[PDB]
Amino acid sequence: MEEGGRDKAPVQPQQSPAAAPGGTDEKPSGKERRDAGDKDKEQELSEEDKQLQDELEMLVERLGEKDTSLYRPALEELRRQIRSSTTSMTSVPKPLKFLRPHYGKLKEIYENMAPGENKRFAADIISVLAMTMSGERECLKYRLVGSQEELASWGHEYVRHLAGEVAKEWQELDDAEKVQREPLLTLVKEIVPYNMAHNAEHEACDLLMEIEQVDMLEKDIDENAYAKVCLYLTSCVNYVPEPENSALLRCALGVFRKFSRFPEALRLALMLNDMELVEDIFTSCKDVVVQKQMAFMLGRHGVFLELSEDVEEYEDLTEIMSNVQLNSNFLALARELDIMEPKVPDDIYKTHLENNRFGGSGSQVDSARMNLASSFVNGFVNAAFGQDKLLTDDGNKWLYKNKDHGMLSAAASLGMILLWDVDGGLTQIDKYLYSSEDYIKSGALLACGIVNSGVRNECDPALALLSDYVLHNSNTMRLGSIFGLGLAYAGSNREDVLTLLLPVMGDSKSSMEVAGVTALACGMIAVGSCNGDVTSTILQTIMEKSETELKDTYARWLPLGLGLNHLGKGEAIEAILAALEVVSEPFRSFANTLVDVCAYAGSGNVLKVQQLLHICSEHFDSKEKEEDKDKKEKKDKDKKEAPADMGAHQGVAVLGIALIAMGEEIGAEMALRTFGHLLRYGEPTLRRAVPLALALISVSNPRLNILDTLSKFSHDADPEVSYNSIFAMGMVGSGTNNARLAAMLRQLAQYHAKDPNNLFMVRLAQGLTHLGKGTLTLCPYHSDRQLMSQVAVAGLLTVLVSFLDVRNIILGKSHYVLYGLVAAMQPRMLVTFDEELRPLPVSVRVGQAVDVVGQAGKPKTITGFQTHTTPVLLAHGERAELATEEFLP
Amino acid sequence: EVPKEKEKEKVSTAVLSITAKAKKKEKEKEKKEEEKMEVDEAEKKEEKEKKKEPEPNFQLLDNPARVM
Amino acid sequence: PLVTPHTQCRLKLLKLERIKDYLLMEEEFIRNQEQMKPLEEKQEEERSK
């Protein structure tokens, strides 16, 4: 301990501020010049950030705190210069003069008068002088002012431009990772008036830099991955004009302002769709801006590009609408017959060959309901041009043999055989159409809507299936005709055929399953306007469901189209609309949780997730509202599948422990459909946690509840090694887990993982994270499986052809105009880089190296090299344009 | 002779988080909806205090009158 | 295992508060689970003897 002898600064700045009350009065020079000699020297012993220990700043205030309490207030005759010497010298040590209740008094030295241009003695120092202290002001002092009194005094007026120059100072001194400290400053200051802060910070960023935009640009969208309702409403529209005004990267408009379509205003992204039609230079970014506008996140854009430039600049519209759709058919025609696939594999059924010697002999299984699953050896493998003449003879015999619902099912499988087709898809049906039967034509003409699904061109808006519908005096002609056309025009929000198919609801012909899928057919069409659909559904709901207390054919189908007509907005007006509209008995207030959370597809709104638990948690509920706690858990399944894995680990942690562990009817009947809704990628955490409750069948219940959890355990696409689980459970599933009920089911689970080789993207995440619904086509099936008796009769309309929004697969094609380029692409396990050293290595799995149409996989941001510049949108999206430039030798 | 009819009925949701400023801006939403369309409800005080003070201590009693 | 800012940024202040939200709710849901159980049969006489 070598103290003493060199303690100059603990003596003379211990004495001269102690002599400052001894020299304020009767010493006009010593009041001023010793203050200025104190001020610059204390300023100089802080500017190097290589002596944090300052020989004054924690040496003078031991008496100087009681001094400043008697020097600044008690002088009472403060001059115009001596306030600029006192407050410039004594507002510096006040974060360390004072303890944690400094937060109310960062002003009793400073805001007496802020001396001039306080960064004048705080420019080259990063945060030790006042910039940490400036964040201490905006944390607590501005928030209590700007809680209800934003428009206020000097604590707002100068504080605006004070925070303005400080936010310039973060990107001024060193331009380090304190760029991201500016959104740390801009959002803590005036949390709800963020745009009033950001509007000055938009224009300041526009003149800040054009190279130091992009990491702050991704900092915003990382903060926009989850927020409050109003913060996600605010900072996402602040996110919009920064590649519009500062830079013109601008190919991140269409999908990354589909981010901002539903929250802020539907017309606002349509004004950004107008901003697409402003920046028409030249074609290449314009091409891939409008590639996504048809079948990547929405359709319904084919009405705004038939204006005055219909030569090539507005004749991309039909090219977008069906020709690049058919060029995507040329992927599955040309490229995917080249990689793997002849016309009929037909041998996953043949992969059940070694079972006949496992335990003696075989040929014991003769169940007639297995022949339902026999259609999927032909059915699922023949998607994307698995066209079959006389390979449908297993269909052709069984169509003309028995099983009326399988006559509808085998006829509905023909639409899956010719999918995404307009050229000759109806010609395939017509030879298998004229059998003059109810079940054959109702499955085939429903499959005609599946053939032209995603086309939305002129095939039959009211031609075929409207003529099929007006044939009705009877069975599924009444039913199966409205379903296929609303499936085909689900991407559109056309009003006309919605009003053609609204007298289906207004007929009051009391076929119950027809009116239920009528809500599902109109639900797939619209998500926004036409409140008269909500009027039309609840009229027959109050007519029919009020005079019953019975089955979920009422409940699983009629409120679901209401939720599909109001999907994806966290405004909480739609809950005020719907729940106050059907104020009713609790078995009709089953519908309370539907339209509540169908508007709540994905965000962070954890306050909803607690009312998704705390109202109907358990209660033990002796067989009265057990459907509602299942459906309340059904809406826990979404709002979990897109915070991008932040709550997915928390979802599998809660729902593994809480329900299947300490539950009853909520857990052991229904709570596995989360895993059939959360992901379809597959990973051995949840893929092995389900046979913990499946190999233990727990047969005491109506075990098709647990065998429903068998079924969409294989609701993970992208074919895997999971055959080890399903075939070995199929071996114990032939004799035991009786083949009368689920011999269709286990092979439905077996044959669905290898659906084709490819085309597994059914998982509602495009580009990086945006939805692309999608949800309107899947969510009817997991609402349908509640629970039994639709394994035989009614759910066979659903279980085959429920979800049909598969968009294509792979990010391999090049499309440089003649379509001859391949690439040198380099596929890897996805990004982790958030803020690290510049530049940041995007990925980590350098081993795989392909050129052309190779796979997507679970976490793959595939990059490219060889100086082709890949300049298009720099995110990805499976129709890259790929120009050419090499000006770096 | 009441049986003390009691209710568990609730456990208080103690999630102390972003909830705190989210309920506060919801009370701001009621200051446009309540006081601008229709709220004119009122109640009166000190009716129940009035009957207490002029009380007896002059209770009249017939012949076989009990008294502590 | 996603604390990937790796620095004193508000994201790690935002990310960890999300983890606080789900574990408190997992606490309160199982707190409601042992609360609202009016089922008593205690063995239906079989395992109790």
Side-chain angles (χ1 to χ4, degrees), chain A, chain B, chain C residues 1-41 45 48-49:
Chain A
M1 281 72 75
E2 291 87 5
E3 292 87 5
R6 299 294 178 90
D7 292 332
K8 182 65 65 66
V11 168
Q12 191 277 127
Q14 184 60 255
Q15 184 64 41
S16 297
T24 301
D25 192 74
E26 79 260 8
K27 284 178 71 69
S29 66
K31 184 264 301 297
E32 180 68 29
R33 295 295 93 195
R34 292 180 295 172
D35 197 1
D38 196 4
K39 183 174 71 68
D40 59 355
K41 186 261 298 298
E42 191 270 334
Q43 192 272 138
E44 181 64 31
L45 269 71
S46 177
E47 291 296 323
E48 67 275 15
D49 290 329
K50 294 187 65 53
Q51 292 176 358
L52 70 95
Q53 293 81 6
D54 300 334
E55 296 290 327
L56 275 76
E57 193 268 330
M58 293 296 290
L59 272 301
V60 64
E61 82 279 6
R62 299 292 185 267
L63 192 273
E65 174 63 35
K66 299 296 186 291
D67 185 77
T68 307
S69 178
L70 274 72
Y71 182 76
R72 180 67 183 173
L75 193 270
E76 293 291 330
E77 51 98 23
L78 276 304
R79 301 275 75 79
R80 81 280 299 154
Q81 185 179 3
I82 77 171
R83 60 101 183 272
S84 65
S85 295
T86 300
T87 58
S88 178
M89 186 270 291
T90 50
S91 301
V92 175
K94 70 181 176 66
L96 283 79
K97 286 180 180 176
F98 298 105
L99 72 162
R100 298 282 76 77
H102 188 204
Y103 289 160
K105 55 184 181 181
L106 291 93
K107 68 177 179 65
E108 67 181 2
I109 298 171
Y110 183 75
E111 203 177 1
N112 297 116
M113 187 64 205
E117 293 86 5
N118 293 313
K119 69 175 176 64
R120 58 95 175 171
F121 68 102
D124 204 7
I125 183 169
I126 293 96
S127 295
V128 182
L129 201 290
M131 284 66 252
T132 301
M133 188 271 284
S134 299
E136 293 174 353
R137 293 181 69 91
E138 305 297 330
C139 181
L140 195 274
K141 294 178 71 66
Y142 183 77
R143 188 177 64 244
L144 60 88
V145 174
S147 296
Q148 66 182 358
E149 188 64 28
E150 292 87 2
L151 274 299
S153 65
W154 184 263
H156 188 202
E157 297 292 327
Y158 181 76
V159 167
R160 186 262 185 192
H161 188 272
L162 183 63
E165 55 89 16
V166 166
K168 295 299 290 183
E169 193 270 332
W170 294 108
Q171 299 90 15
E172 183 67 29
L173 196 153
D174 193 75
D175 203 2
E177 294 291 326
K178 283 90 171 65
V179 176
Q180 295 181 358
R181 182 64 183 272
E182 189 270 327
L184 266 67
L185 193 275
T186 314
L187 183 53
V188 172
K189 181 181 187 293
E190 53 185 356
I191 299 100
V192 177
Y194 178 75
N195 198 3
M196 192 271 176
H198 190 276
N199 197 4
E201 296 296 324
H202 181 74
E203 295 177 354
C205 184
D206 293 334
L207 57 92
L208 194 145
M209 196 64 204
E210 297 298 327
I211 305 300
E212 197 63 26
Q213 298 301 107
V214 293
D215 58 349
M216 193 278 299
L217 194 280
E218 59 90 20
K219 178 64 188 293
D220 293 332
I221 198 63
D222 198 4
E223 293 179 352
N224 288 318
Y226 61 96
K228 188 58 70 176
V229 174
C230 62
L231 273 73
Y232 183 74
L233 183 67
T234 302
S235 62
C236 289
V237 74
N238 292 119
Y239 177 77
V240 177
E242 290 287 332
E244 182 68 27
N245 197 5
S246 67
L248 276 306
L249 269 297
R250 76 187 169 87
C251 194
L253 198 286
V255 284
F256 293 163
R257 277 73 172 173
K258 185 69 175 176
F259 287 168
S260 177
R261 184 172 177 86
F262 291 99
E264 287 83 1
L266 274 298
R267 56 93 53 83
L268 184 61
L270 195 274
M271 292 299 107
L272 293 166
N273 194 3
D274 196 4
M275 289 303 108
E276 292 180 353
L277 270 70
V278 170
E279 54 192 6
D280 297 335
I281 52 101
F282 62 103
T283 306
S284 296
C285 67
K286 174 54 68 183
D287 186 73
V288 186
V289 161
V290 304
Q291 289 317 126
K292 276 87 79 177
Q293 299 293 327
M294 178 64 204
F296 288 92
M297 72 281 198
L298 84 163
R300 67 181 64 90
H301 76 286
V303 297
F304 290 156
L305 278 302
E306 191 63 26
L307 278 75
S308 67
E309 281 82 5
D310 287 326
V311 177
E312 291 179 353
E313 192 265 331
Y314 284 169
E315 290 294 324
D316 199 6
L317 180 65
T318 310
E319 293 177 353
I320 290 304
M321 188 175 177
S322 295
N323 196 3
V324 301
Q325 179 182 2
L326 194 275
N327 208 168
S328 172
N329 291 117
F330 187 73
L331 188 150
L333 282 171
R335 295 292 93 195
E336 294 296 324
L337 293 175
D338 289 333
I339 295 300
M340 189 270 174
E341 204 258 331
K343 290 184 181 292
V344 276
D346 202 74
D347 285 330
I348 302 98
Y349 181 76
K350 190 263 181 183
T351 313
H352 296 84
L353 184 63
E354 296 293 326
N355 53 0
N356 291 318
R357 296 294 94 194
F358 290 163
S361 297
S363 296
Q364 191 178 2
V365 179
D366 288 329
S367 65
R369 291 177 62 87
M370 184 180 176
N371 207 355
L372 278 73
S374 299
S375 66
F376 299 101
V377 187
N378 197 5
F380 284 165
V381 82
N382 289 320
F385 296 102
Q387 59 183 358
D388 289 332
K389 295 296 185 186
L390 297 175
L391 274 301
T392 62
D393 285 335
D394 54 351
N396 206 169
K397 298 289 103 176
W398 180 56
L399 184 68
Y400 293 157
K401 191 256 291 178
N402 60 358
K403 189 58 70 177
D404 54 352
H405 297 90
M407 294 199 290
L408 190 145
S409 296
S413 66
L414 296 174
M416 293 186 287
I417 293 171
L418 275 83
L419 188 61
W420 295 98
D421 294 336
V422 74
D423 52 355
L426 295 176
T427 64
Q428 295 287 317
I429 304 298
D430 291 330
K431 291 187 285 184
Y432 293 99
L433 183 63
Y434 293 99
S435 179
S436 178
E437 293 292 327
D438 182 75
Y439 293 93
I440 296 173
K441 290 181 180 291
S442 298
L445 294 173
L446 189 147
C448 292
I450 299 166
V451 174
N452 59 5
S453 178
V455 180
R456 69 182 290 274
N457 213 170
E458 52 96 19
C459 181
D460 45 356
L463 191 276
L465 277 75
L466 195 277
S467 65
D468 193 12
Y469 179 69
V470 298
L471 194 147
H472 66 278
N473 51 2
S474 66
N475 206 359
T476 60
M477 298 295 176
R478 177 71 179 172
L479 196 147
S481 179
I482 53 96
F483 183 74
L485 198 148
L487 188 145
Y489 292 162
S492 297
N493 197 358
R494 59 185 293 165
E495 182 65 29
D496 50 355
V497 77
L498 184 143
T499 58
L500 266 297
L501 297 178
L502 193 143
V504 183
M505 188 68 70
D507 197 5
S508 181
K509 184 178 178 181
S510 295
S511 297
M512 184 61 213
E513 289 84 4
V514 177
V517 301
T518 304
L520 295 175
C522 69
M524 289 173 68
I525 297 169
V527 295
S529 296
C530 190
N531 207 166
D533 288 331
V534 177
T535 301
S536 66
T537 52
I538 66 157
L539 256 289
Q540 188 173 359
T541 302
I542 294 169
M543 291 304 108
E544 290 182 352
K545 190 174 172 64
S546 65
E547 293 180 354
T548 196
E549 291 86 4
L550 291 176
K551 68 179 73 65
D552 288 330
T553 305
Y554 293 91
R556 289 174 289 173
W557 289 348
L558 295 176
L560 267 296
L562 289 172
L564 294 180
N565 207 170
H566 292 289
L567 189 142
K569 71 279 289 181
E571 65 181 5
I573 285 95
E574 298 296 331
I576 303 300
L577 289 176
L580 295 174
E581 192 177 4
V582 202
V583 280
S584 62
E585 60 93 18
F587 293 163
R588 290 181 293 173
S589 296
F590 175 78
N592 194 4
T593 182
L594 272 307
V595 195
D596 194 4
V597 199
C598 284
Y600 291 163
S603 291
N605 60 6
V606 180
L607 284 78
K608 187 267 303 171
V609 191
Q610 64 182 357
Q611 72 182 357
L612 190 68
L613 292 178
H614 289 295
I615 286 92
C616 52
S617 295
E618 296 88 6
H619 294 84
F620 179 69
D621 191 62
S622 294
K623 278 77 179 174
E624 293 179 354
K625 68 179 75 66
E626 291 294 335
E627 295 87 2
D628 187 74
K629 289 184 261 74
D630 292 331
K631 187 60 71 177
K632 185 66 70 67
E633 182 60 37
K634 179 67 175 68
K635 308 306 286 295
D636 189 76
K637 300 173 172 63
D638 54 351
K639 194 61 76 181
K640 190 175 286 186
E641 59 92 20
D645 193 68
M646 187 61 70
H649 295 289
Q650 296 296 322
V652 302
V654 170
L655 301 183
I657 296 298
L659 296 178
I660 178 115
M662 352 255 307
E664 293 177 350
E665 186 284 340
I666 297 97
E669 302 280 327
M670 189 268 170
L672 200 275
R673 300 278 75 78
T674 300
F675 293 169
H677 188 272
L678 185 62
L679 54 89
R680 301 165 186 82
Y681 294 126
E683 63 184 2
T685 61
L686 82 164
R687 191 182 289 278
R688 272 72 177 171
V690 179
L692 301 181
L694 261 296
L696 273 300
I697 301 100
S698 298
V699 300
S700 297
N701 59 8
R703 79 275 193 190
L704 269 296
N705 51 16
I706 303 299
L707 269 66
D708 184 74
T709 69
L710 199 161
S711 68
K712 300 292 109 177
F713 167 67
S714 292
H715 194 261
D716 297 335
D718 193 5
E720 293 295 328
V721 74
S722 177
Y723 180 74
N724 195 5
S725 298
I726 306 299
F727 178 72
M729 197 173 183
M731 187 65 204
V732 76
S734 67
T736 62
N737 299 116
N738 295 114
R740 296 292 184 184
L741 293 172
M744 184 271 291
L745 184 145
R746 275 77 54 96
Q747 292 179 356
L748 183 65
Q750 182 63 261
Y751 298 158
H752 183 71
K754 187 69 73 176
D755 49 356
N757 305 320
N758 57 352
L759 187 138
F760 64 84
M761 190 64 212
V762 281
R763 207 176 291 106
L764 273 302
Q766 296 297 109
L768 192 146
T769 186
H770 65 276
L771 189 66
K773 52 197 181 301
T775 57
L776 279 69
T777 319
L778 183 273
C779 189
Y781 179 69
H782 293 86
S783 177
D784 187 76
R785 294 295 96 196
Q786 295 294 114
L787 179 65
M788 199 180 176
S789 70
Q790 283 183 347
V791 299
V793 175
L796 273 72
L797 272 297
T798 302
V799 67
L800 279 79
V801 292
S802 179
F803 60 100
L804 292 170
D805 283 342
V806 204
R807 294 176 287 105
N808 306 316
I809 173 181
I810 45 178
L811 59 96
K813 271 188 183 293
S814 295
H815 289 96
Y816 190 73
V817 182
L818 190 145
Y819 178 67
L821 279 70
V822 275
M825 285 180 282
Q826 196 269 124
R828 282 184 287 173
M829 195 86 70
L830 191 141
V831 307
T832 59
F833 74 98
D834 198 1
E835 62 267 24
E836 281 86 8
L837 57 91
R838 194 267 303 160
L840 291 82
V842 288
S843 64
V844 80
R845 192 60 265 173
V846 77
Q848 281 72 240
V850 297
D851 52 354
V852 68
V853 300
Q855 296 298 106
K858 179 267 177 185
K860 275 81 177 176
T861 304
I862 302 101
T863 61
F865 60 98
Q866 192 59 39
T867 316
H868 196 73
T869 66
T870 64
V872 185
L873 77 158
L874 196 64
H876 277 86
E878 81 180 3
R879 199 166 297 116
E881 184 67 27
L882 294 175
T884 169
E885 186 64 31
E886 204 261 330
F887 68 111
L888 271 303
Chain B
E1 293 303 321
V2 294
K4 187 62 177 65
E5 180 67 30
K6 64 180 72 65
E7 295 292 327
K8 302 285 102 174
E9 179 70 28
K10 276 176 72 174
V11 176
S12 66
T13 62
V15 179
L16 294 176
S17 294
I18 60 173
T19 69
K21 62 100 176 179
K23 61 98 178 177
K24 185 260 292 180
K25 67 181 179 67
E26 182 65 30
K27 300 286 103 175
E28 192 271 331
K29 292 181 181 180
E30 295 294 326
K31 300 287 103 176
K32 186 175 172 65
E33 295 292 327
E34 293 291 327
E35 65 183 0
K36 299 286 102 176
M37 290 74 167
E38 182 68 29
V39 50
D40 285 324
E41 186 176 0
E43 185 64 28
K44 183 60 69 178
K45 193 258 293 179
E46 71 187 1
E47 184 178 1
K48 279 78 178 175
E49 192 270 331
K50 182 64 70 177
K51 65 178 72 66
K52 292 182 180 180
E53 59 185 1
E55 66 182 1
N57 68 2
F58 61 103
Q59 291 86 12
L60 302 175
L61 294 173
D62 290 330
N63 301 116
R66 54 93 40 76
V67 54
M68 187 178 289
Chain C
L2 199 280
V3 292
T4 184
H6 290 168
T7 186
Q8 294 296 319
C9 182
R10 193 178 176 273
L11 286 174
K12 285 172 69 176
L13 183 61
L14 289 175
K15 288 181 176 68
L16 294 174
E17 286 176 353
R18 293 293 308 275
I19 302 169
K20 182 178 257 73
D21 289 331
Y22 290 108
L23 270 80
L24 283 170
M25 284 173 61
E26 186 178 1
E27 185 187 8
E28 293 293 327
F29 182 74
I30 197 167
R31 183 66 178 171
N32 290 318
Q33 183 65 260
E34 291 105 15
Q35 182 60 255
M36 293 179 184
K37 300 286 102 176
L39 68 155
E40 57 92 19
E41 47 92 27
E45 194 177 0
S48 62
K49 294 181 181 180

